[PDB]
């Protein structure tokens, strides 16, 4: 009864995103906080490690029933979905995250932008001396959309657990919507939305009609 | 475990948040009772098709215009250009944008730009509102507004950034309070809400307002802007649910400290919970003024523009506006010289 | 005859920025903040020259040229009652506009952007400030 | 020609402690995203295989499709190793065998 | 006369690393993360020099020189109320720029890359940090 | 005075291996995987020394020395809240760095390679894991 179901969505930013990388592709005269970029196209990306880590940390506050000092100390419902290196049962998880790449660069160009990353100028103001220290932070453009792909596998170990894993995936995406993807999101960064969130059985035989109903209705 | 609040901001006065950039007088045109800010690329593209690219380049290259070759309208008049479709945007002329004539003297040479996104639409960043909220909260919490907030172990005093714990600690539970308070930015508003106010300083010693060459792009009074504030802990939930009645306490202390030394007609009245946002509202709106008194003034004691006593009041000029409220007709300012307390705004916070 | 070639642009940037105006204390009058927008536009143009054809990037070079002229005309630093214009000095001593006139395809555009890379690199090398 | 200076990038990541929220950084090496590799898979047909050639072809197509739907070896639950098989075709390099229907199925199904 | 030869470059790195600036605690001011991009570019250049001739490696060598002079001035550490340039100190004491100026063929390019490898090897051998 | 002669290098390796530091459990902190590249380079140098003259082997000896110091400075193990450098310790107690400087001909090179083989043999003889 092996099957694979692909949750495909559009991560549309509601605010500039700063996931943050190194100076490997930074400009030669830029005192910036660079974002993680594609090596070839030099476009901003959303790495699957960021999505997986943020979603796992968010779902650890809702689906654990016990505070976990480590990802290995996570509950079974999350270990079987995200993986557990200290559990022979759950060493390989059922979720594959994928790097998300910019998918509406043409629309952004037609909207009249000159680059797909902007530089936001902030400062910290001393509260005793009124002395301002400025910073520059690179962000992806607000109306950017990224192709989001998440592959969920079904084997005989998913005999009576698929309807719960589907709910956990929906809850993780929703929690990501009521949170921020990695960055300085406490100052209003990294707000995202999942658009056209649908599930397609890309391998095997499986019925995703009900799941797609809660995807496109509850979201 | 997350609480979501909606903060509605109603500007009672012009509000400027800058990006460090400034329009020069060779970049905007004052005509037809408006300031037109064209797109420089579109202007240059239309000027290469009229064989005036070299003339425009010589106009922009010239580092020392005498008195009139510094304005774009002089170039548009000398070279006989009638087209005005260069993209960009426009700001309606107020009249109280410069104390002199904008088309006669040097007048508005530079305009401080409002913060914009990649699409050119103005918006208020969440970091700015978060800084204002943090000033309100720090000034009204007695465990943060004390003498321990000053780091005296140095050449000159500074703020004790470690007074409110932040960041990870080795082997200790995460204790960042202001990571729990998450202020989002605004959906962008339109350029029809922007004006071209000027800086005026009111001195308690001179008893008059003096204009200064500092022109800013500001949001007009009575603009509605919505923010979403998210809270992830319990203490921060109490703090944000108490954002009003802490803003009122902060404003009461600020009025008893600074605003009581100035004429009552220069001080605005509050419709909702007060707040001070952006540039131009003064030093005491951005500091712990109980502890920064003395230190702040001595920081400027050896400058030509010396801070005397507690400083001067910042009063921009913007058109008078009446509002219709349940109490009747309310004037935003109590004076007839059209003086707004620059940077002032009001807010209401609900628990959506 | 081109002023920028693959064998001389780094040395050309060397000489160009070693001749920049200096204060009486020896510090450069130019700062990276005065040329930040120009550097960003050059970086974006270099990035976009790899994918798209040169005929698509015909407005970007013109915007870059008008930005160069505007920044050179607007940036002023006043010290000791003397006003200098560091961006204009950099533009004339590096022949930025003349090099921009010799941009006709991907190769010349990429060479110019690498020349700007070399200019800012060596500016930072000899004590340029942010 | 696309101006890449290295054929391997360094991806920077970090792990955040669940209790102390401390960030421990870590960098790993990855191959460039749009890199292309030449894939060759030889299949041998003998007297023992003649009644199982179509099943073997179906299994090979399913395996290539599954690899496209999974990651090639690495940290691929976190977004690595996604691959695609382009210009996938089968030709008879030895002996005589008709690969017309197999090529049609390979092009239509991938 | 050439400063990098097959008999002296390892001892040259030996002598250059020992003279680098140190804190009062005795540890080095330079870190590997400051020279990571330069090491990566040198490694890529050395790898690509084996398979192709020096005629069309000129852009890679010029960009390598540009990145060296940029990273020299970019990386600054402020310790005990005093600014230090560790990458600039390493470049000036190891004669990186003068060794780069001597690159004219594949042999000299590979010698320079091996010298850079020797420099980082001896930097790590003497307790240098990442 | 030559530290490595044809009569005592095996005993030198024996004493060196006996002097290597161990863990609280008596296990060797050095592993063969930490010195695998060094051993491969030593074997290739020994194989090449039989036919090729020492003139073309000097670059290989220099790179071998660079690899030795890099692995001395790179490999570190933290156990019981204390850090150690197993390759650096092996190099110091085995007296390898200055045993490399006396490699002046084929005989000294082969002596050093046999010394390294003896070091590996006695390291594995005393419980050295892979």
mmCIF file of C-alpha atoms in Angstrom, chain A residues 27-29 31 41-42 109 114-115 121, chain C residues 32 36 44 47-48 51 63 117 120 130:
data_model
loop_
_atom_site.group_PDB
_atom_site.id
_atom_site.type_symbol
_atom_site.label_atom_id
_atom_site.label_comp_id
_atom_site.label_asym_id
_atom_site.label_seq_id
_atom_site.Cartn_x
_atom_site.Cartn_y
_atom_site.Cartn_z
ATOM 1 C CA UNK A 27 28.264 42.058 -2.739
ATOM 2 C CA UNK A 28 31.844 43.372 -2.687
ATOM 3 C CA UNK A 29 30.885 46.673 -1.107
ATOM 4 C CA UNK A 31 27.936 46.088 4.826
ATOM 5 C CA UNK A 41 20.766 32.814 -10.051
ATOM 6 C CA UNK A 42 21.685 34.798 -6.880
ATOM 7 C CA UNK A 109 9.306 42.734 -12.570
ATOM 8 C CA UNK A 114 14.774 46.591 -9.610
ATOM 9 C CA UNK A 115 15.979 43.692 -7.452
ATOM 10 C CA UNK A 121 17.811 50.396 7.441
ATOM 11 C CA UNK C 32 30.977 53.654 1.212
ATOM 12 C CA UNK C 36 26.147 52.264 -1.698
ATOM 13 C CA UNK C 44 22.235 43.728 -9.660
ATOM 14 C CA UNK C 47 23.648 39.360 -11.687
ATOM 15 C CA UNK C 48 21.086 40.018 -14.393
ATOM 16 C CA UNK C 51 20.619 35.259 -17.470
ATOM 17 C CA UNK C 63 19.358 54.111 -15.000
ATOM 18 C CA UNK C 117 34.306 45.736 -7.889
ATOM 19 C CA UNK C 120 35.543 49.608 -4.155
ATOM 20 C CA UNK C 130 31.816 52.909 5.715
#
